[PDB]
Design a protein around this ligand. Structure first.
Ligand SMILES: N#Cc1cnc(NC(=O)Nc2cc(Br)ccc2N2CCC[C@@H](O)C2)cn1
Length: 270
């Protein structure tokens, strides 16, 4: 069919360090995709993206290189970032946060199951489709932590300070999986309180010290119900060897608490 390979770039969705993300619309089919334009890092992001296929991971359609510029054809998520669904200093309804947290765990289980660590889980990297389905986005900082069933310990300092695990700041080497678990716990905190608990998880940070001293009568913890707060007490554990694993997060009481109705389907009476 002539013209199927032509895409019109209709609007800028976001701009940053990389370059820009544009909304692309197919000339013939009107299919909408997100095009990530990176002017030469990208080689590892494309290589990790080629391994991915899960309903809670941003789809990779392909890549095109035009000189020194790489074009990443990625899933268009019309709901934008989870970040904008979080009301400052409030959060969001607890059943919405639980559903997003379930979907976040499904995505992370998938990535860890294929030996991939995202290393930068935050609400800006969690996108929502038209049906409010969560998708893990941007694999620019991602790496392989398990290869030929052999675990590789990490030492590289990366992520975003309010979401990083304390072992990344205190230890030379650390296991990849507990780091992503920790950042998921900070995401859950943000969804339920509309605020980040600390600037970084270090002894010099007063808010982090208060949490370790179990001062849950302070913000953000006082805004969180005791059932999701008991889960946060198991995720936000300083020792990564004692920190809860994803199989045990799936056994948590709040994680399994019936709270949300399914999407309202159209109905009529008489
Ligand atoms: N890497 C990456 C990436 C970034 N955006 C993707 N898809 C979107 O549809 N993104 C998007 C949609 C809307 Br509506 C508003 C903003 C964005 N983003 C722009 C670039 C930053 C990203 O966090 C979200 C897919 N993958």
């Amino acid at each position: 069919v002539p013209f199927v390979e032509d895409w019109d770039l209709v609007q800028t969705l976001g701009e940053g360090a990389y370059g820009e993300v544009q909304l692309a619309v197919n000339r013939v089919t009107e299919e909408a995709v997100a095009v990530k334009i990176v002017d030469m890092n990208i080689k590892k992001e494309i290589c990790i993206n080629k391994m991915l296929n899960h309903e809670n991971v941003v789809k990779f359609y392909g890549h095109r290189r035009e000189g020194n510029i790489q074009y990443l054809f990625l899933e268009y998520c019309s709901g934008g970032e989870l970040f904008d669904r979080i009301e400052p200093d409030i959060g969001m309804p607890e059943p919405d946060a639980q559903r997003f947290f379930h979907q976040l765990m499904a995505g992370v289980v998938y990535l860890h199951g294929i030996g991939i660590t995202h290393r930068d889980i935050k609400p800006e990297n969690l996108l929502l489709d038209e049906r409010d389905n969560l998708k893990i986005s941007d694999f620019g900082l991602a790496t392989v932590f398990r290869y030929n069933n052999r675990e590789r310990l990490l030492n590289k300092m990366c992520g975003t300070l309010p979401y990083v695990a304390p072992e990344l700041l205190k230890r030379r080497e650390f296991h990849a999986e507990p780091v992503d678990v920790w950042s998921c716990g900070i995401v859950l905190t943000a969804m339920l309180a509309g605020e980040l608990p600390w600037d970084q998880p270090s002894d010099s940070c007063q808010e982090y010290s208060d949490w370790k001293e179990k001062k849950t009568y302070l913000n953000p913890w006082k805004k969180i119900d005791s059932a999701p707060l008991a889960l946060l007490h198991k995720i936000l554990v300083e020792n990564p060897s004692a920190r809860i694993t994803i199989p045990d997060i799936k056994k948590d009481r709040w994680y399994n608490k019936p709270l949300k109705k399914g999407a309202k389907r159209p109905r009529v009476t008489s």
